[PDB]
């Protein structure tokens, strides 16, 4: 974005810089280990309230 | 009748439910700001350099 002004004139050179830098990392683990003991011809249970 | 009127066993069943949970947290962060001639440097964790 450059402009020109024919009516005025700045003194010297100015640079006015600005820097920004960012780094990030993440790591989520979630583990489950479930046992159940049961029988071969096991049927469901109907309680359900 | 003699077979349908017999003594049947009486039992006591014990159930134990256990639950143990553990936590551990560890934070660490430096957050500074340096000013020397003309320069202004700021380092943080949210924003970087």
Swiss-Prot record, chain B:
Origin superkingdom: Bacteria
Membrane-spanning segments: none
Location in the cell: Cell envelope
Function of the protein: Could be part of the type IV piliation system (T4P). May contribute at the cohesion between the S-layer and the outer membrane by forming oligomers. Could also be the main channel through which trafficking is managed.
Family: Belongs to the bacterial secretin family.
Protein name: Probable type IV piliation system protein DR_0774
Organism: Deinococcus radiodurans (strain ATCC 13939 / DSM 20539 / JCM 16871 / CCUG 27074 / LMG 4051 / NBRC 15346 / NCIMB 9279 / VKM B-1422 / R1)
Boundaries of the shown chain within the full protein: 495 to 543 of 740
């Amino acid at each position: 974005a450059a402009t020109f002004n024919p009516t005025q004139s700045f003194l010297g050179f100015n640079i006015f810089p600005t820097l920004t830098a960012l780094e990030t990392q993440g790591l989520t683990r979630r583990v489950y280990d479930g046992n159940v003991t049961m029988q071969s011809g096991q049927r469901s249970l109907s309680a359900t309230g | 009748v003699p077979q349908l009127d017999q003594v049947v066993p009486q039992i006591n069943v014990q159930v134990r439910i256990q639950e143990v949970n553990e936590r551990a947290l560890q934070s660490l962060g430096l957050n500074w700001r340096a000013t020397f001639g003309g320069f202004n440097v700021a380092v943080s964790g949210g924003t970087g350099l």
